[PDB]
Design a protein around this ligand. Structure first.
Ligand SMILES: Nc1nc2c(ncn2[C@@H]2O[C@H](COP(=O)(O)OP(=O)(O)O)[C@@H](O)[C@H]2O)c(=O)[nH]1
Ligand SMILES: [Mg+2]
Ligand SMILES: [Mg+2]
Lengths: 425, 70
């Protein structure tokens, strides 16, 4: 059961490169692609993310996309840069200028067919393809515009497969341009229609965690990417190691998505580490309380402001399964109002013996109605500019029409009202 | 959706090409109309000066008439 990984744009390639470095270490794969691990329980499901090449080499089933060579040249030089298939680097020369329209309609449309040729080649060499996972940001131009363009084209060619994304939401606290609410709203509109599951990784939440919790006053993208790669590792553990719960993308979607449009997940992680941090190993009760706390959410939403439709918890490392079950049952009994009563047993728990890194950790995946706070924040920012048609010339100049913006704004407002409807049920 | 994707890029081409077209024609019209205006200003100026020479020839002739009828 193979997954085809695609990473697009600066953010998509930076978080994507970290994800591959992290899991390559976990699976005992070195930068040359050779296996040198101390367990085989690393190679049991290695084929989910890696292909097997000539001299017993494991090659990531990853496709690196960007309209600018810069970020991809940085990857090719980084630690695990040589692990990727050289043919799978697909890049243009004229970037996207943080413009969704350029990535989706003009610059991106010129490069998209060559990317699909690589996607097709990777798919044809799959015994049984489960689907695709895309890493990207929604505030830029390549990952946002060209990424959603790729999703649309892939869906047309593989309508019966799962489309999963790790989508980095933009925030004024960690911003590159004022047009981020435009790019994000346009991308969310695409995501609501063409993805089965999206992990909402909020830069606002990643910033507040680094600043308020870790006390990293003046955090860098590297600091935010430390949390991201750790969360990405946790949420994909069930797909990379032998397990019974959410072992593939489809079963995960069936367990987590009660309504087709409501597929935006709020990840959580514990303990919150800081690059090069100190000594203790968090008890099971401590892991559980933290992963459910607003301060550990990777989306800037207060779960106490909504209700959980479904939840998937994953514990990693050697620990008491009896204690895990007691702690998991306790969080629900102590906060039963924040879990919808009309979805019985909506909190599932998995445990993996192999820890990340750390001695023991816990990853949370929640489909909460509080996620509307993220879409409300973006919608507010989008409307503040769209109301006065600010910066629209950059988009209309690429061929886009104002009607397209009105539809994206409306679809996202509908998404918010749908999340609110199920919160009042 | 593919249909709209093609309509967007073609709309962008049709607008830039049409803008380049109009600018080219308006610039050529301005440079031409300017050439006509400047040349007209010089033509009228020379016409005024020529009318002044025609008047000097008529003065020299008007003296020729008075000298003979003296
Ligand atoms: N977490 C994270 N966010 C990033 C990173 N680089 C850019 N961003 C965010 O992504 C958006 C910009 O998109 P980017 O990936 O730079 O541009 P693209 O090349 O057009 O896809 C903004 O919202 C940034 O805050 C990164 O490495 N990590
Ligand atoms: Mg990106
Ligand atoms: Mg982007």
């Amino acid at each position: 059961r193979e997954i085809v990984h695609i990473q697009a744009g600066q953010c998509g390639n930076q978080i994507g490169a970290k994800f591959w470095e992290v899991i390559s270490d976990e699976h005992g794969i070195d930068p040359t692609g050779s296996y040198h691990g101390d367990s085989d329980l690393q190679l049991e499901r290695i084929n989910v993310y890696y292909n097997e090449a000539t001299g017993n080499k494991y090659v990531p089933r990853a496709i690196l996309v960007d309209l600018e060579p810069g970020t991809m040249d940085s990857v090719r030089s980084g630690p695990f840069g040589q692990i990727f298939r050289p043919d799978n680097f697909v890049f243009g020369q004229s970037g996207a200028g943080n413009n969704w329209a350029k990535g989706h309609y003009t610059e991106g449309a010129e490069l998209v067919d060559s990317v699909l040729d690589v996607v097709r080649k990777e798919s044809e060499s799959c015994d049984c393809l489960q689907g695709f996972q895309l890493t990207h940001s929604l505030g830029g131009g390549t990952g946002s515009g060209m990424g959603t363009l790729l999703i649309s084209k892939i869906r047309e060619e593989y309508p019966d497969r799962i489309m999963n994304t790790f989508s980095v939401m933009p925030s004024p606290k960690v911003s590159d341009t004022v047009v981020e609410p435009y790019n994000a709203t346009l991308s969310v509109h695409q995501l609501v229609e063409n993805t089965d599951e999206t992990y909402c990784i909020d830069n606002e939440a990643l910033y507040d965690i680094c600043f308020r919790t870790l006390k990293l006053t003046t955090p860098t993208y590297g600091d935010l990417n430390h949390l991201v790669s750790a969360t990405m590792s946790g949420v994909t553990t069930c797909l990379r190691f032998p397990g019974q719960l959410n072992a593939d993308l489809r079963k995960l979607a069936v367990n987590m998505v009660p309504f087709p449009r409501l597929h935006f997940f709020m990840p959580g992680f514990a303990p919150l580490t800081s690059r090069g941090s100190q000594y203790r190993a968090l008890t099971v009760p401590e892991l559980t309380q933290q992963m459910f706390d607003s301060k550990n959410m990777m989306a800037a939403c207060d779960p106490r402001h909504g209700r959980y439709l479904t939840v998937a918890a994953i514990f990693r490392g050697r620990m008491s399964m009896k204690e895990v079950d007691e702690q998991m049952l306790n969080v629900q009994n102590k906060n039963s109002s924040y879990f919808v009563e009309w979805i019985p047993n909506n909190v599932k728990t998995a445990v993996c013996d192999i820890p990340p890194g750390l001695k023991m950790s816990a990853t949370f995946i929640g489909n909460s109605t509080a996620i509307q706070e993220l879409f409300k924040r973006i919608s507010e920012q989008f409307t503040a500019m769209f109301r006065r048609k600010a910066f629209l010339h950059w988009y209309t100049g690429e061929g886009m029409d104002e009607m397209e913006f009105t539809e994206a704004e409306s679809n996202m407002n509908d998404l918010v009202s749908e999340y609110q409807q199920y919160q009042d049920a | 959706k593919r249909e709209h994707e093609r309509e967007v890029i073609q709309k962008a081409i049709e607008e830039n090409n049409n803008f380049i077209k109009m600018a080219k024609e308006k610039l050529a019209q301005k440079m031409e109309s300017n050439k006509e205006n400047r040349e007209a200003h010089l033509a009228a100026m020379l016409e005024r000066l020529q009318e002044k020479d025609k008047h000097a020839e008529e003065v020299r002739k008007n003296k020729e008439l008075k000298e003979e009828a003296s």
